[PDB]
């Protein structure tokens, strides 16, 4: 196959049957297999959060720059004081709810049958948490549509997921650094590049 | 030569190469970024 740079064999501890492999592990992090499993779940969650992030930034900035809604810049977006609720409450509520989410995901990763067997009451829903897979929980709660009912033979879907998500993570690092040394939004930097590309790049920042 | 590179990889020759490169690095940093007591970036 095509493994991330020709002229190099992929490492023998990862090949083929994994979501978008391409054999990039020059620093020997997926050498231990359980470490690779943990890192796969880490990658999937990271990429999905990053995809939601890139959507929530690009969409808001399309609304902002064009002028459909007066939303704040991604950089200066956290200090928006909401009337109904406060950020001091929102951090705690996020802690509670995302703890109930991520600890459940974890206890499934270490024990796949968990969260659905016995005394795992979530409003009587102890069946939507069957898991079916590590990193791909499935079930009526998590995939209501069920585009990939099967998940082992869904290599196209998982590959699309992981590729779009690697790219979204790289775009989020872009949002982090591009808007810490330029102090504008991504769409602003884009239209700055699409006016005079050979005069507005990273290195044209003196 | 294979043996010349075997000697260049010996501990003292490689140590002085490594520390000459490193010393040039720190030297040029303390010339370009002299007199440094505090890390001011995101301070």
């Amino acid at each position: 196959r095509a493994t991330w740079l020709p002229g190099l064999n992929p490492p023998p501890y990862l090949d083929g049957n994994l979501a978008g492999d391409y054999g990039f592990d020059p620093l020997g992090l997926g050498e231990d297999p359980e470490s690779l499993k943990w890192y796969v779940q880490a990658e999937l969650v990271h990429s999905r959060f990053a995809m939601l992030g890139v959507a929530g930034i690009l969409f808001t900035d399309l609304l902002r720059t064009t002028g459909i809604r007066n939303l704040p810049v991604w950089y200066e977006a956290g200090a928006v004081k909401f009337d109904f609720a406060s950020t001091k409450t929102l951090i705690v509520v996020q802690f509670l709810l995302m703890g109930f989410a991520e600890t459940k995901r974890y206890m499934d990763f270490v024990s796949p049958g968990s969260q659905a067997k016995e005394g795992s009451f979530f409003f009587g829903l102890e069946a939507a948490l069957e898991g079916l897979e590590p990193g791909y929980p499935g079930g009526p709660l998590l995939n209501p549509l069920g585009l990939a009912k099967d998940v082992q033979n869904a290599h196209d879907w998982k590959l699309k997921e992981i590729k779009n998500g690697r790219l979204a993570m790289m775009a989020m690092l872009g949002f982090f650094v591009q808007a810490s040394v330029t102090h504008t939004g991504p769409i602003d930097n884009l239209v700055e590049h699409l006016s005079n590309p050979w005069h507005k790049t990273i290195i044209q920042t003196l | 030569m294979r043996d010349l590179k075997t000697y260049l990889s010996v501990a003292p020759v490689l140590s002085t190469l490594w520390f000459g490169s490193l010393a040039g690095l720190l030297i040029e940093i303390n010339r370009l970024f002299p007199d440094a007591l505090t890390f001011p970036f995101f301070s």
Binding site: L125, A127, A128, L129, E130, G131, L132, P137, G138, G139, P140, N143, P144, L145, G146, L147, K149, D150 | -
Partner: protein
């Protein structure tokens, strides 16, 4: 009940094996107008049933159907006013809601071992968890759960078989297939059908759970050279196999083009021998008492798809000693000489 649907899935082979279930249903309650909502090439089996009423085409495994088509078929099942669904589509919620939107008294389905089957019990009066998620891979029977619940001991005997797979052909399909092999050099009593040819065609009638089920052609050239000619008619799934078979095994070798399973059973009913691999033709040969041999790629797979070889006493089963469909091609010729005469 009086009106009963069937939302069966898979194609030729899975819907063929459902005939004892339909005969069980009509044996259970006296007059039932059974319907079928199957996939394409599933309707083509239902000339051979003498029991049922509509037998539509839906492709239930589409999983993103045309919403006009989806809404139309939901409303069609509502306008037929069923009493019992009997899905065996092997899906949960999303499809359990599809069976639930039908105004049905008895919502019955199959359910994943996985998660895409949760919240289905709410909308089904029977759960029927299955195995492998590749339901044809379970073998011949595939419906022992549904056979044992339909007709529980509540008043009388279950009667779960009634000499399983009694398919039946009519005179019209008999006449047209009679013309089709009479265009070949076959006599109406003395020939042998095959229906095993390596091809890329969906008329192969194999399974959902079998992969390497169809025998090759040069292996078949060895088989047809080792056997004496009792006029072996060759049943191709597509016309591009005709010249390929005439290149491999010869021009004198008769080729009968059959893609319809009703036409295939009509060609069974005039034959005197069957050299089928794991297709619909083994079960069609066991229907109407024709002596088969039943090639397979595994002894265990042959036991899963034929548990009744000891019963008919003609379908002397042959499989490969390894997997991968490479058998001896010798002793199968020997008991082909034994049982066909």
């Amino acid at each position: 009940v009086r009106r009963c649907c069937c939302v069966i899935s898979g194609g030729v082979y899975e819907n063929l094996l459902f005939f004892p279930t339909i005969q069980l249903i009509k044996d259970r309650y006296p007059g039932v107008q059974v319907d079928i909502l199957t996939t394409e090439r599933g309707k083509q089996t239902y000339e051979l049933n003498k029991n049922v009423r509509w037998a539509n085409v839906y492709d239930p495994d589409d999983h993103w159907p045309e919403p006009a088509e989806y809404t139309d078929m939901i409303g069609l099942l509502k306008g037929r006013y069923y009493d019992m669904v009997l899905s065996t589509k092997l899906a949960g919620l999303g499809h359990a809601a599809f069976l639930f939107m039908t105004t049905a008294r008895d919502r019955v389905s199959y359910i994943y071992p996985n998660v895409n089957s949760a919240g289905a019990g709410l909308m089904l009066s029977e759960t029927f968890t299955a195995e492998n998620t590749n339901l044809s891979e379970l073998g011949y029977s595939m419906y022992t759960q549904m056979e044992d619940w339909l007709g529980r001991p509540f008043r009388s005997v279950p009667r779960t078989p009634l000499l399983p797979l009694r398919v039946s052909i009519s005179r019209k399909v008999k006449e047209v297939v009679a013309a089709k092999y009479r265009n070949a050099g076959a006599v109406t009593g003395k020939f042998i059908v095959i229906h095993g040819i390596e091809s890329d065609s969906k008329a192969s009638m194999q399974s959902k759970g079998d992969a390497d089920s169809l025998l090759s052609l040069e292996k078949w050239a060895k088989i047809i050279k080792g056997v004496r000619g009792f006029k072996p008619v060759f049943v191709i799934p597509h016309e591009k196999e005709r010249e390929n078979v005439e290149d491999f095994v010869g021009d004198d070798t008769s080729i009968v083009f059959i893609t319809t399973p009703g036409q295939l059973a009509a060609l069974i009913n005039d034959s005197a021998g069957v050299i089928a691999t794991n297709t619909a033709a083994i079960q069609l040969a066991n229907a109407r008492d024709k002596p088969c041999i039943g090639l397979f790629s595994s002894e265990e797979k042959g036991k899963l798809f034929v548990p009744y070889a000891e019963e008919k006493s003609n379908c002397v089963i042959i499989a490969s000693k390894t997997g991968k469909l490479a058998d001896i091609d010798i002793g199968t010729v020997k008991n082909a000489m034994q049982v066909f005469e």
